[PDB]
Every structure is written in C-alpha cells, then in structure tokens.
C-alpha cells in the first residue's frame, strides 16, 4: 500500500503483538485469587487492551513490518483523521487562547498602573473576555482587513 504498509486488520504482526501482550497480562493474573481486587484490576486491563487493538483495527490505520501503527501526514484523504483534522482542532484552540490573551493585554494597557493587573488578574474582566475566542477567526480576519491587527509604525 502507501509506502509499502499493509492494513492492521490484514497484518499478522499486529495480531501477534495483541495476543502476546494479552497472555502476558493473563500470566501475571493467575494469582491472588480468581476474584480478589487485583484479579479484577488485571481483567479490566485485559479488556481495555482488546478494545484498543480492535479500535485501531476499525479505524483503518497502516502497519509495517514491526507490527505497530504508522502515520500518513501527506494530505491523502483516507488519513485526515491522523493529522489534518486534529491539526485544525489544535489551530482553532491555540488561536482561541492567544486571541483572548492579546485582547486582555490590550484592554488593560491604558490603566495608570498596568503592571498591577499583570501580576494580579482582573477576573471579572477576563470572564467577559474568555468567550470572544469562540469567534476569534472572524474577528481576526476583519481585524486584518481593518489595518487593525498590526501595530502601525513599528
């Protein structure tokens, strides 16, 4: 397939890893009781392992000769769940944080003692500003067209 990687459903190495880890867990299990709390913890971990391997099977990830999952970030459309849509999520959240921070900085810059509001936050003001990040993209766009994002004469 892409870069020679075959699917984790069809990968024998992927399966081998799954069953090796599972029965290593279950060899560590055969102790303490068949019902004591340690046994219950170990069985929960076994079930979580099965869920993890099966989910990676469902999601159509690519495996190599190692038997572990690989990531395709080229832009191919069968793999946007790997990098590009979590990347869009990240860029949105990051811009949110930074936009709120810059608007707070601007809001307090005209105070007589601006440093007093830097080391001691004005929490009601920030509470009014937190939710503008929700539309930070549109605002930042109309602030770029306005000639309003970049400090003139710097």
């Amino acid at each position: 397939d892409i870069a020679g990687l075959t699917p984790c459903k069809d990968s024998k190495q992927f399966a081998k890893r799954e069953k090796q880890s599972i029965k290593k867990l279950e060899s560590s299990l055969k102790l303490y009781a068949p019902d004591s709390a340690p046994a219950l913890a170990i069985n929960a971990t076994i079930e979580k392992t099965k869920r993890r391997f099966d989910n990676y099977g469902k999601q159509g990830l690519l495996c190599g000769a190692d038997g572990l999952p690989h990531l395709i970030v080229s832009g191919d459309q069968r793999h946007w769940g790997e990098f590009i849509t979590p990347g869009i999520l990240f860029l949105y959240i990051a811009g949110w944080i930074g936009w709120v921070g810059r608007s707070y900085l601007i809001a307090i810059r005209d105070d007589k003692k601006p440093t007093q509001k830097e080391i001691i936050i004005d929490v009601p003001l920030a509470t009014g500003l937190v939710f503008r990040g929700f539309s930070w993209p549109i605002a930042a766009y109309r602030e770029l067209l306005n000639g309003e994002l970049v400090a003139k004469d710097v």
Partner: protein, 733 residues
C-alpha cells in the same frame, strides 16, 4: 619591543605572566600589531600561505615514507580483503612483554599500528603497487615542500614583494583560478586516470620509464579530432572482472554506466575519468568571463551595480558591494569558509554512499572514521565562516559607503530575522523532544503500539522518483512510461536502477519513523546554531544594552556589572556559545550514521528500526551495548590490542571534565589563592633565594573561556574517536 613579544609594545611592558600567554595567542592577528600597514599585512599573509603549503606537503610525505618503510602495502595488494594495513611501527620503552605480543599483528615482526585513514585503498585505486612507488612519491613531496618554502622566502624581500593593488585584482584571479587552477588540474587528473590507473586495473604497469611507449586506447587520439568520440566507449569492462588482472578486462577509457564495480563495490574508473574530463571542459570554458588586459569580458562591479529591481523592494540593490568585498579580508574569508564547509559535508555525504576506492566499502572501520572526521571538520569550518562575518562587521564595515543596499537592509531588520529563527527553533525543539518523550513513556508502560510513529512520506517519495521500488509509489524513474525513465534508459539508468535497488550498499537506504525523528532533531540543531551565530554577527556593532560595542573590538570580557550585568556580551562570546551547539549537532548526526550502519553491517536492520524511536533505545542498545570490548581492553586478567583505546577512552573523559573547571569557576577565586601562594613562597627559607621574574597571576576571563572550551572539545573528539574505532574494529563488522 626590547622583550617578547615584539609585535605588541603594550604586552611587552606587562610584568605578569599574562605577557607570555597573550603573546602566543595574538601572533597571527596581523591587523593588531604595532606599525601595521596594508602592504605588511598582505605580504605577511602571502608568506604564511606558502608556509602552510610546505606543511601539507611534508605531512603527506611522512605518510608515504612511513608506510613504505614500516608498512604492509605489498602483502595488502595481494589480498585486500584478508589483511590489515599497517600505519607505522611502535617503539615504546615503557612497554611490557604482553603488550609487545598483543600489538604485533598484520604479519609484522614487532608492535605496529593498523591504519584507518584509508590510504592503502586510495593509493591502490590510483596505481601505486610496490614500495618503490611510495618511496618515489615521498621524495617528490619532500622536494615540493622545499620549493614551497623557497617561494615563501623569496616573496618577502624587496625586489619581489607585490603591491596591495596586485592583490586587489579580482577579475584576473578569478579567470586564472577558474580555468587554470580548477580546469587544468582536473584535465591532468583525467589524464592520470586514463594513462596509469585504468591500465593499472587491467594488469599493465605503466610508469615514467615506458609511458611514452604504451597506447591508452587502441586507436590513440584518432577519434578525438575526427569527432566520433563514441569509439572511446565501445568495449567496457565486463561485469565479471577481477580488479588488478586481465580476466574480464575491456578497452574503454571513458564511459557513463552509473552502477558499481561488481567485485570491489566501487565506482568504475572509466566513469571517473569521463567525469573529470567533462567538468574540466566546463571550468575551462567558464574561466573566460571577466575582463583583463585584452579589452573584452565583464566588469564585476558593473554587474553588481546593474542588479537592482525596479519597484525598490531591495532598496539600492547591490550598488557598492564590489568595494565592500574587495577591501575587507574578513568578508572574503567568511565567504571562503562558508563555501568550503558546505562542500566538506557534501564530501562526507557522497563518499559513504558512492565509494570511489576499491575494497573500501568492505572496510567498515575506515568508512565510519572518514565520515566522522569530515563531518566534524565541516562543523568547525561553519562556525569559523560565521565568526569572520562578525569580525568583518566590527572592523572593516563602512555604513555610509553601503547606504541602503542589501547589506544595510540586512542590518535594518535584524529583529525580524532573529525572531523568526527563534520561533523555528522553539517549534522544532518542542515537538521533537515531545514526541521522543511520548514514545519513551509509551514503551515504559509496555504499550509500544501507542507510539506516535510519523512516516517520512516525502523522502520515501523522492527515493521513489530516483527509481526505488520499496514503497510502491511509481513516479519518475519508478513508473513505466514516463519521459524521465524513457530518455535515459539507454545510458546510465540500467546501472543506476541496479545499484539503487540493491539493499546491501548504502545508496539510498530504506527509511522509517526513526529516520523522521532524528532528521527533525538535526534540523533543530542546525537552526539553533544558526540562530546563535547570526545573532552574534548582526549585534556585533551594537545593541540596546550596549550601543557602542563596535568601539571595544571583537573580543572583550564584559562591560562590568552595571545595567543589570553584561557577562558574555561580545560577538566572540556568541561564537564561543555556538561551538557547544555545533558539537552537539555533529554528535547527533554521527550517532545516527553509526548506529544505522552498524546494524546494517550485521544483518540486523530491524534492531535499529525498532529501537530508534525512543531515547532509552539509543542509550541502551547503541551506547551501552557497543561498549563491552572497548572497556575490556585491559582488566585484572590481562590486556589485548584494544588496550590503547580503553586507555584513550578514559583520557577523553578526563580532559573533558577538566574543561568544566575553567568553565564553571571564574577568575577572582583563583587570583586570591595565588596571592596567598606568593606570600607563602616569599616567606620560606632556602626557597626565597629563588625569585621569579614574572609576577604570577590567574588567567584572564576570555583566556579562561578559551582554555575551558579547548579542553571540552578535545575531550569530546578523543572519547568519541576511541569508542567509534574500538566498537567497529572489535567486531570488524
């Protein structure tokens, strides 16, 4: 004067030991000596160049003479794969008998050293066969050393010293260096290959006493003038040839095949002769550009002044750069060092993937040694290329004469350059270290399937475009009917595709997640070293914390503790900080190369591919695992021939640590200690009858930094060299 040193009167009147130290470390900075002219500076540098040339010839003379005298060459030529080449003999009176027995190898009659420079393979490749050739060459090199010295002397008297404006004729020098120094030399080397080495690898021994009587081709110089050059490639060496024999030999002298020689896993000799001829033609034609005494050609200054884009986005363009470059020697040296550094690591990258010498790809230790040597020298050359830019900005830069051209414009937005370099290096560091730590944690918890393993799909794509068929991309040279594969299928594409698709050479090794991560670490290193050096250069004329820095020189301790404190504010200090990052970066690069290759040479590539993605893998499976033989070189039960490396390994660890002292402890503490000692001595009987002549003092601040850095990097190089050689030589595989 009236004292050492003569060049500085200010140092000569220094009554402390400082006078001696600084006397030595200022001896070649000619621009800082008393009564210096332009002519004296230029003439000193010319004679110094001649001295360095003599040095190089004497050193290569020594190597030739010593392997011809105490060496192994003759037996090595009979079986290059089953004998170890000798460097020279050991005579050490502190030796005990078991060490005497331990170091006696290679068939010698006493203790010797094995060579790893690779000179047996290189000299064998170009034609030398018996000890008389090596003796001959050594004597000729001695002669050329003496002639170099004679010219150096001759060009220092009157009646023979050139003028400053002879040295400032740039068009003349470039014409000669392009068509004479690069073109004629490459033509004569193509000649040596066609006349001596191509026959040498076919059984015949052409030498000075018979070469006028042996044709290099069956129809000598006929084809060349009649025009049909193709006859020179009409019968290549068959692909079952044995190097220094006639079995399977052809007659061609120039080819274009692409592949390797099947037996030696090396480049064809005919390919290299043809390459040198081609580039010599290019250089000769291109060395006729600029104008001289004959009324045709180009003025460099006019080309530079005519290149200004309308719309004024580059300001005044390049107007006035000819005189900025022609009048500054530090500018020219920075340019020279930058170009030479880039092509030095290009040498490193091309000599391991496309070996030129026969039976050198099968000598693993020489491969690793050569690669590490050339990469480290390239790194030092880069740091110097950037240092002389800051020296140029301080000393020789003239603002009003460069008004509004590209250079002053660089100075005008230094904040935007430094800020973006800073952003880039922050980004790379954050994400690279973050993914490595993610992976390490994932494996500590027993879940290696939870790793983040990004696949380098762009480098895999570029490898496909060169004809690799391991990733099924089917692009240029890897597709079926594309014009790229179609237009070259007849000449070099067979050999190239045959070599690139073999998986026991080093031509485009397979890559995976580990390669991705370490390549981003390499990018981080390059960006951060560039940030340090560029900031040091662009801030050397002054900053906001010290706006008059240019009035203080390239190197000075500080500006005292005022204004918050100014430790390490000179541009010399930026260089000193950048050397650490250079060493770290070359470390990452060479660790990558050596681990990948040592697992490939063992048929255990999956080991690297699995352990390279988390840092515990690097620490345990590369550093710890490959150290056993070296550190067992000597032990309570005896010593073997790894002893000298087991010793050296520790030397490097010691020197390094001593460098920490000079770097962490600073001057005042030591000066007070020394005052105490001076009292003690002056007060003791039978010993105060002895009087020093220089008052002892602690070292200087800049001096202490330099001495610490020297210890640090000496320790660095020595420990890594010992480990690399002992861990490849111990396996010899």
């Amino acid at each position: 004067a009236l004292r050492f040193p003569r060049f500085s009167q200010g140092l000569a009147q220094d009554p402390t030991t400082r006078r001696i130290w600084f006397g030595i470390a200022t001896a070649h900075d000619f621009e800082s000596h008393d009564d210096i002219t332009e002519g004296r500076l230029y003439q000193n540098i010319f004679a110094s160049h001649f001295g360095q040339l003599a040095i190089i010839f004497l050193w290569t003379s020594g190597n030739l003479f010593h392997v011809a005298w105490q060496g192994n060459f003759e037996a090595w030529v009979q079986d290059p794969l089953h004998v170890r080449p000798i460097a020279h003999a050991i005579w050490d009176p502190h030796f005990g008998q078991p060490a005497v027995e331990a170091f006696t190898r290679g068939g010698a009659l006493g203790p010797v050293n094995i060579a790893y420079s690779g000179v047996y393979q290189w000299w064998y490749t170009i034609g030398l066969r018996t000890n008389e050739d090596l003796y001959t060459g050594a004597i000729f090199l001695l002669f050329l050393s003496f002639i170099s010295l004679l010219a150096g002397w001759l060009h220092l008297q009157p009646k023979w010293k050139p003028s400053v404006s002879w040295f400032k004729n740039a068009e003349s020098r470039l014409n000669h260096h392009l068509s004479g120094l690069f073109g004629v030399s490459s033509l004569a080397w193509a000649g040596h290959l066609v006349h001596v080495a191509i026959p040498g690898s076919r059984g015949e021994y052409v030498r000075w006493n018979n070469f006028l009587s042996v044709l290099p081709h069956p129809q000598g110089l006929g084809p060349l003038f009649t025009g049909q050059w193709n006859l020179y490639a009409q019968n290549p060496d068959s692909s079952n040839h044995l190097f220094s024999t006639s079995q399977g030999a052809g007659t061609a002298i120039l080819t274009l095949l692409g592949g390797f020689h099947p037996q030696t896993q090396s480049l064809w000799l005919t390919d290299m002769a043809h390459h040198h001829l081609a580039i010599a033609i290019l250089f000769l034609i291109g060395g006729h550009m600029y104008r001289t005494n004959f009324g045709i050609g180009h003025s460099i200054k006019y080309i530079l002044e005519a290149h200004i884009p309308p719309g004024g986005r580059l300001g005044r363009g390049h107007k006035g750069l000819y005189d900025t470059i022609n009048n500054s020697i530090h500018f020219q040296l920075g340019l020279a060092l930058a170009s030479l550094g880039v092509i030095t690591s290009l040498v490193a990258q091309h000599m391991y993937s496309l070996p030129a010498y026969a039976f050198i790809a099968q000598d693993f230790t020489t491969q690793a040694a050569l690669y590490t040597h050339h990469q480290y020298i390239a790194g030092f050359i880069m740091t110097g290329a950037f240092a002389h830019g800051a020296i140029f900005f301080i000393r020789d830069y003239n603002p009003e004469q460069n008004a509004d051209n590209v250079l002053a414009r660089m100075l005008e937005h230094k904040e935007a350059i430094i800020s973006h370099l800073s952003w880039a290096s922050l980004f790379l560091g954050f994400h690279t270290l973050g993914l490595y730590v993610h992976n390490d944690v994932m494996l500590a918890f027993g879940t290696p399937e939870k790793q983040i393993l990004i696949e380098p799909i762009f480098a895999q794509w570029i490898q496909s475009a060169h004809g690799k068929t391991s990733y099924g991309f089917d692009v240029l040279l890897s597709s079926t009917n594309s014009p790229a594969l179609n237009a070259g299928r007849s000449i070099w594409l067979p050999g190239w595709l045959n070599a690139i698709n073999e998986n026991s050479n080093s031509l485009f090794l397979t890559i995976g997640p580990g390669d991705f991560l370490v390549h981003h670490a390499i990018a981080l290193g390059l960006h951060t070293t560039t940030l340090i050096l560029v900031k040091g250069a662009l801030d050397a004329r002054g900053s906001k914390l010290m706006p008059d820095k240019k009035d203080f020189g390239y190197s000075f301790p500080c500006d005292g503790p005022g204004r918050g404190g100014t430790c390490d504010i000179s541009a010399w200090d930026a260089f000193y900080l950048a050397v650490f990052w250079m060493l770290n970066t070359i470390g990452w690069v060479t660790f990558y190369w050596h681990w990948k290759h040592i697992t490939l040479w063992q048929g255990n590539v999956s080991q690297f591919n699995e352990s390279s993605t988390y840092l515990m893998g690097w620490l345990r499976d590369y550093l710890w695992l490959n150290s056993s033989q070296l550190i067992n070189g000597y032990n309570p039960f005896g010593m073997n021939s790894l002893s000298v490396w087991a010793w050296m390994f520790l030397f490097g660890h010691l020197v390094w640590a001593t460098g920490f002292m000079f770097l962490i402890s600073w001057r005042g503490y030591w000066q007070e200690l020394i005052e105490t000692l001076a009292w003690a001595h002056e007060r003791t009987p039978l010993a105060n009858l002895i009087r020093w002549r220089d008052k002892p003092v602690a070292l200087s601040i800049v001096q202490a930094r330099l001495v610490g850095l020297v210890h640090f990097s000496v320790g660095y190089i020595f420990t890594y060299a010992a480990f690399l050689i002992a861990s490849t030589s111990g396996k010899f595989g």
